[PDB]
Amino acid sequence: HMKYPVEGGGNQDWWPNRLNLKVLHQNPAVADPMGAAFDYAAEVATIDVDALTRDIEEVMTTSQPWWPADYGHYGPLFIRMAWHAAGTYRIHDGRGGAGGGMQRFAPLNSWPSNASLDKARRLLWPVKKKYGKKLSWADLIVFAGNCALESMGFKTFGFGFGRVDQWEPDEVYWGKEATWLGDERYSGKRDLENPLAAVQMGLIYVNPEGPNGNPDPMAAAVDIRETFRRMAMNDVETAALIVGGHTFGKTHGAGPADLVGPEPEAAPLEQMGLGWKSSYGTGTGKDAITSGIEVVWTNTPTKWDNSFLEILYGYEWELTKSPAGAWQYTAKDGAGAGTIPDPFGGPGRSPTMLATDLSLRVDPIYERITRRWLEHPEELADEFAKAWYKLIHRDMGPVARYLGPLVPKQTLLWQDPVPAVSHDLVGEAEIASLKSQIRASGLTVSQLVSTAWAAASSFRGSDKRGGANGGRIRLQPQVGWEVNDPDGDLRKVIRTLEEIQESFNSAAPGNIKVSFADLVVLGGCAAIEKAAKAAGHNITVPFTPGRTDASQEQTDVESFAVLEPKADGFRNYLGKGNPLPAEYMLLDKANLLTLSAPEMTVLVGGLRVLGANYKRLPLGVFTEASESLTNDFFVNLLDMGITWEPSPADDGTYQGKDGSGKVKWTGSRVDLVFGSNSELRALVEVYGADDAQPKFVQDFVAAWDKVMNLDRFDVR
Amino acid sequence: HMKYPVEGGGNQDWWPNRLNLKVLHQNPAVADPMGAAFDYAAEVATIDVDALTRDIEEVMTTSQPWWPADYGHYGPLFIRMAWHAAGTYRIHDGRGGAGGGMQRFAPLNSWPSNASLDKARRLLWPVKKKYGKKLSWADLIVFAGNCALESMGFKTFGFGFGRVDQWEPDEVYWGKEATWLGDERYSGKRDLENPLAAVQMGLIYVNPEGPNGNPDPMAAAVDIRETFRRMAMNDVETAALIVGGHTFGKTHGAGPADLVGPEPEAAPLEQMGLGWKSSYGTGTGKDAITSGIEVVWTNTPTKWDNSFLEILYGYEWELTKSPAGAWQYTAKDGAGAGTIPDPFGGPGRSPTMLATDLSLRVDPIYERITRRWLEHPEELADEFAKAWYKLIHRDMGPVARYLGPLVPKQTLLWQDPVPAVSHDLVGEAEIASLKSQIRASGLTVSQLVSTAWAAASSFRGSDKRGGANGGRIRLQPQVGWEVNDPDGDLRKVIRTLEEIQESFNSAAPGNIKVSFADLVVLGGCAAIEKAAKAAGHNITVPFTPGRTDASQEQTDVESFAVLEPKADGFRNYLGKGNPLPAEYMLLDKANLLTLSAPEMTVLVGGLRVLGANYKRLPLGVFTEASESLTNDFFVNLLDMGITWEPSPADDGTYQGKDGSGKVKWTGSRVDLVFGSNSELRALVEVYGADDAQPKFVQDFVAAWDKVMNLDRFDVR
Ligand code: HEM
Ligand code: HEM
Ligand SMILES: OC[C@H]1O[C@H](O)[C@H](O)[C@@H](O)[C@@H]1O
């Protein structure tokens, strides 16, 4: 049954797997109530942090009747809240994470693992109310967690504000399963489907009752190890994170799970966007039901100390069931009876642990890490500080974006740092001079453009890693990436740009210097200025200097792995192992570059004729002109005098012939989608009209400049 | 199975009937390749119309191998094209129509009834190519049809350019049926579901083989009568349209319908956005297969004459079947054998008609109209001209919008015309003076604001009918509309404004005058300036004079019926017979006002406290203040100190109580959705913060001013 648009119906219902260009217009300006002048960086730098901290530290100790506070302190709940907000991150595509406060929107707000955090978010309204424009929910949600930690005795490594709120949810592939807590994502031995980073649909990392509900610690550890790995956490960081978290607070499963109402997005209006309404007892506090598990890890649930580990090794564990029928461990032979305080004044309870908590003692690598901390709790405190910090800042992008008086100076490898400007910067005259020098270097328009795109286009906008700043194109791994093709030139191109760097720098007027990283981008710009004149157009391509050159030591090769493009329609590259065909991988790539459909479109057309393609293949190259910047791609794409068919050599390519029956052009799926898809073709008709050529060049230059500048938060 | 976003997956899949705010951000700026400076009106006024016309005439006579031209002329095909582009229009919501050139996007590009028009659109590319930015496809598609008519000997009444192209499809409820050509839309005797205007899913009006494939002319007529009626056509207009159209061209069904490939949106990339590829013979021209019916109405298929009616009455008709097995009539006893020319040089054929063509002779009302024109073909010509003109211009809005040197001066009733400015206009000092006079009039902030909103908010953005210009609030039917509530005041308000109109006008300085229509809007603005100070805020509400006062003679009461709000969340009105609950009807209304979510939101929260509601009901009115302009609505909507439940008196309302158990607020679905829905609540938190109040006022004014000015194409 097709439905009203206002109820969700549309063209996706008629052609289930059509290309959805709505990924190229998420969070549109028109749905943003702040208006165009709004600059959060400027707002949030007026915020009195101290007052905010204290305003938060009051909300924590001021219980509220509609969700009373465990042990008269919401801190632990907030820590969980923040950990869940940041804990959706995954390294494969850099999406998830706390960076856009997405936990307040669907689907995340209604994930089973985020049960009860609806009420946690609500409790902070009085803080938001007070601070308004100057404080994003995104910053608030994780700052609350960081304040909770400090409040209850744990001194963190620091904090950074900057996270800009958005107004419609970021749409993200979370898995194929159409049922909450479902599993259709493993294959082979236990290989987790790429790009997911959770073991079941609706969870953060793993199942707290062990794999598929099976409470075997040893196995659970394999799931922990691997999911946490896919959120950028190695064994140490992972163990630090779990013990540190579970040093505070408790689970909730005081009665049957079937007396819990529907999730927020499916709840009735009177609940005011809150869900999971419990008819068991008071439904809250004492009778709270969040996970279904009823554990309290430590006997100091609102203080920081070594209790968690002391208790983990200090007892022997056996399987039991919570009052809701979920697995958990409690201590053998009624040991530690009544040593654990009740959240609301009741009598004491026995020690308890999750299945997954036992993983930290049973798994041999984790045993070794946690035993060590059993006797050296200060190594724990330190490791938890670093990993917590990393956790809630992983998607913040370059350091430049980190704001506030709580940001520490120290450089961290995982931030993919770049050096500070150490010299003066090239002015107009030196830029102009350097462009000439590059044009005479003997490097072709194709080489220069390819190399510039290679480096800059490594940026992804999800976690804002990658980009041309750093000059990492010449380091491992970027330099040896198939798509960047070391077997092609590249090394020839690098060498030549290093020679020009040194020459300019040896003869520089006084104290101006230029980085390698700036020259790579500058080369492309020059090359494009050259191809503009070759097409009888005179323009200057804008260029913003400032990039600095990282070194191999300051570049984590392993972490850079996830940015290797396994596909890039802008160079007609298509590797193996992509989850959908080429036209969809093109769009997702455009998404990751923050590009709009117009922008995506101009770049493809421009890039092709400039000779940007992988191995310089002829695919898409609809021009007779050599390294000239024309709209030829478009004009030829709309030539009905040409007839397209799959290549006989059935290889994902197409042959376009004329009246004479001779192949005239070749193209791939990525090329032809622009003339097939009715929305994209519309755009091609703008850029392929007879009056279109100046506009094509202008917009192409603007889009190119946009990609070059993507990671340049240092000047914004 | 949940899918990747880029393949269509999203939150709609998890909660099938959730509120889709994407109706309030259609055709976003970021996906428009023209840029912000683009002004079609200024582009299209540079177009040389004569050259365009000749450029189009050349395309019509220049056949192309991939779809050769019937009788060496594409005119008829373009007429059909244009008629289908305009012929999706429906009066109930004023959506469909030619105004946004939506035929080139999904779903319309792939409707069955639009089969072959993919190729018809493609033929015009050379025209668009040449004209570029100065000509929308929207204007081109219908203009082509208009040029085809003139070219083949029919002088039309005129034409207006102005249709601005869009870049993503307008999403519109076309019916519930999940199958092409399906029928789940009739009930009772044969009541067609509101708001549809076609008998089956994917058709324009009716089935050319008669109701549900049953070739009974008498019955078909009932469908024709009523579908055409719902596209604003009476019996005369309707018969004129059919005979006029079918004077030209032919149908296509030369072989089996199962040898026709999939529709455009489901076709493979190599077809370049074309569909219905036919393996029957050459697949085109002689072997063309469009509808499956093989009729050629007249023996002069590329000239305008009275052949159609001469043939209809000149013969006796019997059932037969096209080579593809569809129903049609041909002439009895081998009469007129070989008198009808073949589209590609073949031997002649017998006379033929559609089932729905025979309706025009069999139905008694149609028989009377068409018999008359059998002998008076000039009455036909005249009627066809007026009805065609109306057809392709119905959604163009106020006359101001109509551009180009081919627009005739003559006023038409169906355009809901307003008079020309006949006097000078009030300047700053008379505006300011008139505001004070209104403030002293003894009319309350509630009355003034209600009335303004009542008139202005009659605008729907789909066909751009309605609005405050015309001053039709005081005329039938707008004055006697339940929601406008004549039983309320209104008449008191009108009278008082007419008095102030005359007073100012009798004492005007020289030759300045003010219309009633301007005062209604000016009132509301004053009222709001008043409530701004009452809330300790000093602002001037912008106001744009120029509206003129229509009369009852110049106001088609019947046609204004479809604009009666059957719901309006902005005044908490909710009539009966709406298709979905109140919160959805709110959004759809916001869509019709061209409002964004931020805009919709500020208005509701402003309007409530100003006392805008239907019967001044207390619902939503979350303020202690009387006719004051505060954000109170928001602040109170986010008070957790209040607990909401349905009203015991189960009447679609809600009671919100405090700690004391006493009802403190009441609200409806429309009110509470703003605190339930996670996206809307996010907006509410902007406007409820402590720093929010200035911004609330500013944006509220901007949004109010935007609704006042909706129909003011006379100043844009
Ligand atoms: C193996 C990884 C983890 C698993 C399987 C896990 C599972 C859980 C579960 C099921 C709950 C109970 C939710 C409820 O029903 O109330 C919980 C609570 C909690 N978690 Fe974890 N968690 C993990 C890691 C973490 C991490 C990394 C942190 C933070 C660094 C953390 C901090 C907390 C805190 C403070 C609570 C207490 C909630 C309250 O006081 O109301 N957990 N965890
Ligand atoms: C009772 C309402 C109508 C019905 C049932 C109807 C049906 C049809 C059908 C089914 C075709 C076959 C398309 C093909 O096989 O190529 C056709 C052709 C055509 N129709 Fe109508 N139509 C209606 C109203 C109109 C109107 C209002 C016009 C415009 C005034 C019109 C103009 C045309 C023209 C010009 C063609 C010939 C196209 C060509 O030569 O390729 N029709 N009609
Ligand atoms: O960012 C680093 C680069 O620029 C600096 O100005 C140095 O002089 C140069 O040696 C270095 O390669």
PDB file of C-alpha atoms in Angstrom, chain A residues 1-8 10-12 14-20 22-23 25 28 30-34 66 104-107 109-110 122 125 129-133 137 167-169 171-173 175-180 184 194-195 201 263 265-266 269-270 272-274 579-580 584 587 596 598 637-638 640 644-646 654 669 672 675-676 678-679 681-683 685-691 695 699, chain B residues 1-8 10-12 14-20 22-23 25 28 30-34 66 104-107 109-110 122 125 129-133 137 167-169 171-173 175-180 184 194-195 201 263 265-266 269-270 272-274 579-580 584 587 596 598 637-638 640 644-646 654 669 672-673 675-676 678-679 681-683 685-691 695 699:
ATOM      1  CA  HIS A   1       0.000   0.000   0.000  1.00  0.00           C
ATOM      2  CA  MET A   2       1.373   3.408  -1.141  1.00  0.00           C
ATOM      3  CA  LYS A   3       1.028   6.177   1.426  1.00  0.00           C
ATOM      4  CA  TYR A   4       0.774   9.940   1.682  1.00  0.00           C
ATOM      5  CA  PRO A   5       4.193  11.694   1.504  1.00  0.00           C
ATOM      6  CA  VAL A   6       3.490  13.293   4.882  1.00  0.00           C
ATOM      7  CA  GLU A   7       3.214   9.705   6.157  1.00  0.00           C
ATOM      8  CA  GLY A   8       6.358   8.602   4.268  1.00  0.00           C
ATOM      9  CA  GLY A  10       7.448   8.434  -2.261  1.00  0.00           C
ATOM     10  CA  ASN A  11       9.242   7.065  -5.351  1.00  0.00           C
ATOM     11  CA  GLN A  12      11.402   4.666  -3.303  1.00  0.00           C
ATOM     12  CA  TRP A  14       7.788   2.139  -6.711  1.00  0.00           C
ATOM     13  CA  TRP A  15      11.419   1.346  -7.567  1.00  0.00           C
ATOM     14  CA  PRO A  16      12.818  -0.092  -4.328  1.00  0.00           C
ATOM     15  CA  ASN A  17      16.510   0.105  -5.171  1.00  0.00           C
ATOM     16  CA  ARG A  18      16.749   3.392  -7.047  1.00  0.00           C
ATOM     17  CA  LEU A  19      19.544   5.857  -6.392  1.00  0.00           C
ATOM     18  CA  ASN A  20      18.658   8.134  -3.528  1.00  0.00           C
ATOM     19  CA  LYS A  22      18.769  12.658  -0.679  1.00  0.00           C
ATOM     20  CA  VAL A  23      22.106  11.620   0.754  1.00  0.00           C
ATOM     21  CA  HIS A  25      21.203  17.147   0.762  1.00  0.00           C
ATOM     22  CA  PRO A  28      19.460  21.263   4.517  1.00  0.00           C
ATOM     23  CA  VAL A  30      15.940  25.510   5.199  1.00  0.00           C
ATOM     24  CA  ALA A  31      15.195  23.211   8.175  1.00  0.00           C
ATOM     25  CA  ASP A  32      17.841  24.936  10.304  1.00  0.00           C
ATOM     26  CA  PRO A  33      16.171  27.354  12.731  1.00  0.00           C
ATOM     27  CA  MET A  34      19.448  29.231  13.543  1.00  0.00           C
ATOM     28  CA  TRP A  66       9.526  10.974  36.931  1.00  0.00           C
ATOM     29  CA  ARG A 104      18.547  12.680  20.255  1.00  0.00           C
ATOM     30  CA  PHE A 105      17.128  11.637  16.853  1.00  0.00           C
ATOM     31  CA  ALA A 106      15.816   8.463  15.249  1.00  0.00           C
ATOM     32  CA  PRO A 107      16.846   5.693  15.029  1.00  0.00           C
ATOM     33  CA  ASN A 109      17.072   7.649  20.363  1.00  0.00           C
ATOM     34  CA  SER A 110      14.963   4.458  20.067  1.00  0.00           C
ATOM     35  CA  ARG A 122      15.508  15.106  29.405  1.00  0.00           C
ATOM     36  CA  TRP A 125      16.975  20.416  29.604  1.00  0.00           C
ATOM     37  CA  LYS A 129      17.539  26.171  28.690  1.00  0.00           C
ATOM     38  CA  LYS A 130      19.975  28.326  30.560  1.00  0.00           C
ATOM     39  CA  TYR A 131      22.772  28.332  27.967  1.00  0.00           C
ATOM     40  CA  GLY A 132      20.689  28.399  24.753  1.00  0.00           C
ATOM     41  CA  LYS A 133      22.449  29.104  21.426  1.00  0.00           C
ATOM     42  CA  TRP A 137      23.139  19.262  22.761  1.00  0.00           C
ATOM     43  CA  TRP A 167      18.104  19.241  12.822  1.00  0.00           C
ATOM     44  CA  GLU A 168      17.399  16.076  10.926  1.00  0.00           C
ATOM     45  CA  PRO A 169      19.047  12.723  11.568  1.00  0.00           C
ATOM     46  CA  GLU A 171      21.068   8.541   7.746  1.00  0.00           C
ATOM     47  CA  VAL A 172      23.466   5.662   8.074  1.00  0.00           C
ATOM     48  CA  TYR A 173      23.515   1.967   7.258  1.00  0.00           C
ATOM     49  CA  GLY A 175      22.741  -3.326   9.195  1.00  0.00           C
ATOM     50  CA  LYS A 176      20.230  -5.262   7.058  1.00  0.00           C
ATOM     51  CA  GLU A 177      18.175  -6.829   9.838  1.00  0.00           C
ATOM     52  CA  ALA A 178      14.589  -5.560   9.926  1.00  0.00           C
ATOM     53  CA  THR A 179      14.060  -6.670  13.576  1.00  0.00           C
ATOM     54  CA  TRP A 180      15.459  -5.204  16.766  1.00  0.00           C
ATOM     55  CA  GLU A 184      22.328 -11.567   9.828  1.00  0.00           C
ATOM     56  CA  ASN A 194      31.782  -4.610   6.890  1.00  0.00           C
ATOM     57  CA  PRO A 195      31.215  -1.740   7.897  1.00  0.00           C
ATOM     58  CA  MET A 201      20.940  -4.578  15.255  1.00  0.00           C
ATOM     59  CA  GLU A 263      10.201   2.810  22.233  1.00  0.00           C
ATOM     60  CA  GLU A 265       9.484   6.965  18.189  1.00  0.00           C
ATOM     61  CA  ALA A 266       6.533   4.605  18.539  1.00  0.00           C
ATOM     62  CA  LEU A 269       2.037  11.851  22.182  1.00  0.00           C
ATOM     63  CA  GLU A 270       1.382  12.296  25.899  1.00  0.00           C
ATOM     64  CA  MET A 272       6.484  13.924  25.220  1.00  0.00           C
ATOM     65  CA  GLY A 273       8.901  11.856  23.160  1.00  0.00           C
ATOM     66  CA  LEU A 274       9.816   9.559  26.062  1.00  0.00           C
ATOM     67  CA  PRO A 579      28.755  -3.533  -1.086  1.00  0.00           C
ATOM     68  CA  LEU A 580      26.757  -2.037  -4.011  1.00  0.00           C
ATOM     69  CA  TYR A 584      25.841   4.030  -5.500  1.00  0.00           C
ATOM     70  CA  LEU A 587      27.088   8.874  -4.414  1.00  0.00           C
ATOM     71  CA  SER A 596      25.944  18.368  -3.409  1.00  0.00           C
ATOM     72  CA  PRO A 598      25.496  19.852  -8.699  1.00  0.00           C
ATOM     73  CA  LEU A 637      26.522  12.582 -22.879  1.00  0.00           C
ATOM     74  CA  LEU A 638      23.351  14.204 -24.315  1.00  0.00           C
ATOM     75  CA  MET A 640      21.294  11.091 -29.235  1.00  0.00           C
ATOM     76  CA  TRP A 644      25.067   2.703 -25.986  1.00  0.00           C
ATOM     77  CA  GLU A 645      25.366  -0.994 -25.166  1.00  0.00           C
ATOM     78  CA  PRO A 646      27.265  -3.133 -22.637  1.00  0.00           C
ATOM     79  CA  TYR A 654      29.763   0.333 -22.274  1.00  0.00           C
ATOM     80  CA  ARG A 669      28.333   2.662 -15.009  1.00  0.00           C
ATOM     81  CA  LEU A 672      26.464   6.719 -17.925  1.00  0.00           C
ATOM     82  CA  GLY A 675      22.557  10.280 -18.671  1.00  0.00           C
ATOM     83  CA  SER A 676      20.244   7.652 -17.347  1.00  0.00           C
ATOM     84  CA  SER A 678      16.396  11.467 -14.518  1.00  0.00           C
ATOM     85  CA  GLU A 679      17.618  13.833 -11.733  1.00  0.00           C
ATOM     86  CA  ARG A 681      20.489  14.095 -16.370  1.00  0.00           C
ATOM     87  CA  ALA A 682      18.584  17.301 -15.491  1.00  0.00           C
ATOM     88  CA  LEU A 683      21.826  18.657 -14.074  1.00  0.00           C
ATOM     89  CA  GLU A 685      21.379  19.560 -19.326  1.00  0.00           C
ATOM     90  CA  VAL A 686      22.240  22.682 -17.456  1.00  0.00           C
ATOM     91  CA  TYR A 687      25.975  22.162 -17.993  1.00  0.00           C
ATOM     92  CA  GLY A 688      25.608  20.917 -21.572  1.00  0.00           C
ATOM     93  CA  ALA A 689      23.547  23.753 -23.030  1.00  0.00           C
ATOM     94  CA  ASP A 690      25.231  26.172 -25.486  1.00  0.00           C
ATOM     95  CA  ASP A 691      25.383  29.059 -22.978  1.00  0.00           C
ATOM     96  CA  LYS A 695      29.211  28.684 -15.678  1.00  0.00           C
ATOM     97  CA  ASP A 699      31.220  26.110 -10.640  1.00  0.00           C
TER      98      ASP A 699
ATOM     99  CA  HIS B   1      15.367  -6.067   4.852  1.00  0.00           C
ATOM    100  CA  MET B   2      16.804  -2.639   5.760  1.00  0.00           C
ATOM    101  CA  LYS B   3      18.886  -1.004   3.022  1.00  0.00           C
ATOM    102  CA  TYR B   4      21.691   1.489   2.613  1.00  0.00           C
ATOM    103  CA  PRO B   5      20.483   5.132   2.566  1.00  0.00           C
ATOM    104  CA  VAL B   6      22.012   5.583  -0.883  1.00  0.00           C
ATOM    105  CA  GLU B   7      19.706   2.744  -1.935  1.00  0.00           C
ATOM    106  CA  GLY B   8      16.739   4.224  -0.082  1.00  0.00           C
ATOM    107  CA  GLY B  10      15.939   5.293   6.433  1.00  0.00           C
ATOM    108  CA  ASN B  11      13.766   5.730   9.556  1.00  0.00           C
ATOM    109  CA  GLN B  12      10.559   5.389   7.586  1.00  0.00           C
ATOM    110  CA  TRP B  14      11.450   1.256  11.249  1.00  0.00           C
ATOM    111  CA  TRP B  15       8.327   3.285  12.071  1.00  0.00           C
ATOM    112  CA  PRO B  16       6.241   3.068   8.863  1.00  0.00           C
ATOM    113  CA  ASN B  17       3.775   5.823   9.679  1.00  0.00           C
ATOM    114  CA  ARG B  18       5.931   8.418  11.363  1.00  0.00           C
ATOM    115  CA  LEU B  19       5.651  12.092  10.494  1.00  0.00           C
ATOM    116  CA  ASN B  20       7.771  12.926   7.476  1.00  0.00           C
ATOM    117  CA  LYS B  22      10.758  16.085   4.373  1.00  0.00           C
ATOM    118  CA  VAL B  23       7.561  17.618   2.925  1.00  0.00           C
ATOM    119  CA  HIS B  25      12.131  20.930   2.654  1.00  0.00           C
ATOM    120  CA  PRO B  28      16.131  22.409  -1.350  1.00  0.00           C
ATOM    121  CA  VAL B  30      21.620  22.980  -2.168  1.00  0.00           C
ATOM    122  CA  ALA B  31      20.464  20.645  -4.987  1.00  0.00           C
ATOM    123  CA  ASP B  32      19.668  23.556  -7.343  1.00  0.00           C
ATOM    124  CA  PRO B  33      22.497  24.071  -9.852  1.00  0.00           C
ATOM    125  CA  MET B  34      21.374  27.597 -10.836  1.00  0.00           C
ATOM    126  CA  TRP B  66      15.266   6.355 -32.899  1.00  0.00           C
ATOM    127  CA  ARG B 104      10.412  14.798 -16.514  1.00  0.00           C
ATOM    128  CA  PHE B 105      10.778  13.241 -13.009  1.00  0.00           C
ATOM    129  CA  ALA B 106       9.566  10.227 -11.122  1.00  0.00           C
ATOM    130  CA  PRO B 107       6.885   8.975 -10.889  1.00  0.00           C
ATOM    131  CA  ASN B 109       8.009  10.125 -16.237  1.00  0.00           C
ATOM    132  CA  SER B 110       7.296   6.448 -15.788  1.00  0.00           C
ATOM    133  CA  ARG B 122      14.038  13.878 -25.701  1.00  0.00           C
ATOM    134  CA  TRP B 125      16.693  18.677 -26.276  1.00  0.00           C
ATOM    135  CA  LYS B 129      20.308  23.244 -25.724  1.00  0.00           C
ATOM    136  CA  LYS B 130      20.044  26.389 -27.751  1.00  0.00           C
ATOM    137  CA  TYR B 131      18.121  28.473 -25.242  1.00  0.00           C
ATOM    138  CA  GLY B 132      19.764  27.264 -21.966  1.00  0.00           C
ATOM    139  CA  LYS B 133      19.069  29.218 -18.742  1.00  0.00           C
ATOM    140  CA  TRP B 137      11.650  22.568 -19.551  1.00  0.00           C
ATOM    141  CA  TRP B 167      15.505  19.639  -9.453  1.00  0.00           C
ATOM    142  CA  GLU B 168      13.841  16.950  -7.367  1.00  0.00           C
ATOM    143  CA  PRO B 169      10.309  15.634  -7.838  1.00  0.00           C
ATOM    144  CA  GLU B 171       6.028  14.258  -3.893  1.00  0.00           C
ATOM    145  CA  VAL B 172       2.296  13.902  -4.066  1.00  0.00           C
ATOM    146  CA  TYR B 173      -0.328  11.338  -3.039  1.00  0.00           C
ATOM    147  CA  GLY B 175      -3.537   6.882  -4.669  1.00  0.00           C
ATOM    148  CA  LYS B 176      -3.005   3.890  -2.373  1.00  0.00           C
ATOM    149  CA  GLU B 177      -2.635   1.208  -5.051  1.00  0.00           C
ATOM    150  CA  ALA B 178       0.804  -0.459  -5.071  1.00  0.00           C
ATOM    151  CA  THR B 179       0.329  -1.778  -8.617  1.00  0.00           C
ATOM    152  CA  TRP B 180       0.254   0.088 -11.930  1.00  0.00           C
ATOM    153  CA  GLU B 184      -8.951   0.662  -4.801  1.00  0.00           C
ATOM    154  CA  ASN B 194     -10.802  12.410  -2.446  1.00  0.00           C
ATOM    155  CA  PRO B 195      -8.395  13.978  -3.597  1.00  0.00           C
ATOM    156  CA  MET B 201      -3.204   4.402 -10.581  1.00  0.00           C
ATOM    157  CA  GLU B 263       9.453   1.781 -17.750  1.00  0.00           C
ATOM    158  CA  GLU B 265      12.952   4.517 -13.917  1.00  0.00           C
ATOM    159  CA  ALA B 266      13.436   0.739 -14.064  1.00  0.00           C
ATOM    160  CA  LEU B 269      21.640   2.575 -18.007  1.00  0.00           C
ATOM    161  CA  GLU B 270      22.316   2.231 -21.733  1.00  0.00           C
ATOM    162  CA  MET B 272      19.838   6.934 -21.250  1.00  0.00           C
ATOM    163  CA  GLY B 273      16.686   7.429 -19.192  1.00  0.00           C
ATOM    164  CA  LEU B 274      14.367   6.150 -21.938  1.00  0.00           C
ATOM    165  CA  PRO B 579      -7.728  11.477   5.529  1.00  0.00           C
ATOM    166  CA  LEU B 580      -5.158  11.391   8.419  1.00  0.00           C
ATOM    167  CA  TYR B 584      -0.232  15.133   9.541  1.00  0.00           C
ATOM    168  CA  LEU B 587       2.233  19.438   8.152  1.00  0.00           C
ATOM    169  CA  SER B 596       9.645  25.329   6.529  1.00  0.00           C
ATOM    170  CA  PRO B 598      11.174  26.400  11.748  1.00  0.00           C
ATOM    171  CA  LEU B 637       5.722  22.677  26.345  1.00  0.00           C
ATOM    172  CA  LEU B 638       9.143  21.731  27.780  1.00  0.00           C
ATOM    173  CA  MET B 640       8.600  18.381  32.879  1.00  0.00           C
ATOM    174  CA  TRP B 644      -0.075  14.820  30.072  1.00  0.00           C
ATOM    175  CA  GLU B 645      -2.843  12.327  29.453  1.00  0.00           C
ATOM    176  CA  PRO B 646      -5.789  11.994  27.053  1.00  0.00           C
ATOM    177  CA  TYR B 654      -5.193  16.220  26.438  1.00  0.00           C
ATOM    178  CA  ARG B 669      -2.731  16.438  19.047  1.00  0.00           C
ATOM    179  CA  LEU B 672       1.552  18.151  21.759  1.00  0.00           C
ATOM    180  CA  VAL B 673       3.177  16.829  18.614  1.00  0.00           C
ATOM    181  CA  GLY B 675       6.841  18.087  22.354  1.00  0.00           C
ATOM    182  CA  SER B 676       6.545  14.442  21.284  1.00  0.00           C
ATOM    183  CA  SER B 678      11.970  14.381  18.277  1.00  0.00           C
ATOM    184  CA  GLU B 679      12.717  16.746  15.389  1.00  0.00           C
ATOM    185  CA  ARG B 681      10.940  19.202  19.887  1.00  0.00           C
ATOM    186  CA  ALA B 682      14.483  20.103  18.820  1.00  0.00           C
ATOM    187  CA  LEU B 683      13.125  23.333  17.305  1.00  0.00           C
ATOM    188  CA  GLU B 685      14.172  23.884  22.497  1.00  0.00           C
ATOM    189  CA  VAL B 686      15.675  26.655  20.456  1.00  0.00           C
ATOM    190  CA  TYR B 687      12.676  28.932  20.954  1.00  0.00           C
ATOM    191  CA  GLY B 688      12.108  27.950  24.624  1.00  0.00           C
ATOM    192  CA  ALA B 689      15.601  28.681  25.924  1.00  0.00           C
ATOM    193  CA  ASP B 690      16.175  31.669  28.161  1.00  0.00           C
ATOM    194  CA  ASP B 691      18.036  33.720  25.534  1.00  0.00           C
ATOM    195  CA  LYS B 695      14.873  35.740  18.170  1.00  0.00           C
ATOM    196  CA  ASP B 699      11.497  35.015  13.238  1.00  0.00           C
TER     197      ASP B 699
END
